[PDB]
Design a protein around this ligand. Structure first.
Ligand SMILES: Nc1nc2c(ncn2[C@@H]2O[C@H](COP(=O)(O)OP(=O)(O)O)[C@@H](O)[C@H]2O)c(=O)[nH]1
Length: 183
């Protein structure tokens, strides 16, 4: 049976890098393909980038308990979420599964699939995260303050997760995640 790992963290401690490294390291890793009700962009392939479904069908899936989690995107322009069945089928086939979501999505997945392993990717320090959020300083004081407040709230509840991987260095953080996925 394949492990299911749920990767989350602060909304900007940086995850598309770690995900890329993980997919290169584990040749048959299944990266969960979310359902959405927006339309495809040119270049997007149904079943690969998203599972493109229509608003009516998505509501069916909600009511039948077929989403591990879902949310309204841009205040309800459309919806996106994680489908239970592909994840369960991949795991029963023996293939490891990675789900990458925001913190609210990860909290919801722990309820619908408790055997999933939740991992919070933390920064090596507060000062490290703060420097990245100031960045080049092209954002106003009010926006930066709001991002610093948001990060503190999100960091303060890393205890709800099963595992904390501290992102000190790409190669060791990615190594720790490989151990969880195929160990
Ligand atoms: N909770 C939930 N949100 C999702 C899911 N997939 C994508 N989203 C959100 O939809 C938004 C925009 O999607 P898009 O611009 O195509 O690229 P993305 O941001 O990397 O997913 C992001 O804020 C995501 O957090 C999902 O499976 N579940």
């Amino acid at each position: 049976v394949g492990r299911v790992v749920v990767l989350s963290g602060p909304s900007a401690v940086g995850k598309s890098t770690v995900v890329r490294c993980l997919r290169e390291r584990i040749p048959n890793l299944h990266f969960s393909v979310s359902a959405t009700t927006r339309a495809p962009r040119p270049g997007e392939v149904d079943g690969v980038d998203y599972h493109f479904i229509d608003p009516t069908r998505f509501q069916q899936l909600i009511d039948q308990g077929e989403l591990l989690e879902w949310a309204e995107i841009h205040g309800g322009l459309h919806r996106s979420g994680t489908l239970a069945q592909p994840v369960r089928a991949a795991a029963a086939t023996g293939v490891p599964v990675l789900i990458e979501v925001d913190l609210a999505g990860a909290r919801a997945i722990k309820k619908t699939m408790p055997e999933a392993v939740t991992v919070f990717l933390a920064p090596p320090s507060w000062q490290d995260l703060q420097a990245r959020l100031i960045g080049r300083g092209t954002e106003t004081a009010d926006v930066i303050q709001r991002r610093l407040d948001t990060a503190r709230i999100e960091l303060a509840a890393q205890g709800d997760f099963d595992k904390v991987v501290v992102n000190r260095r790409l190669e060791s953080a990615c190594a720790e995640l490989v151990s969880l996925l195929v160990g």
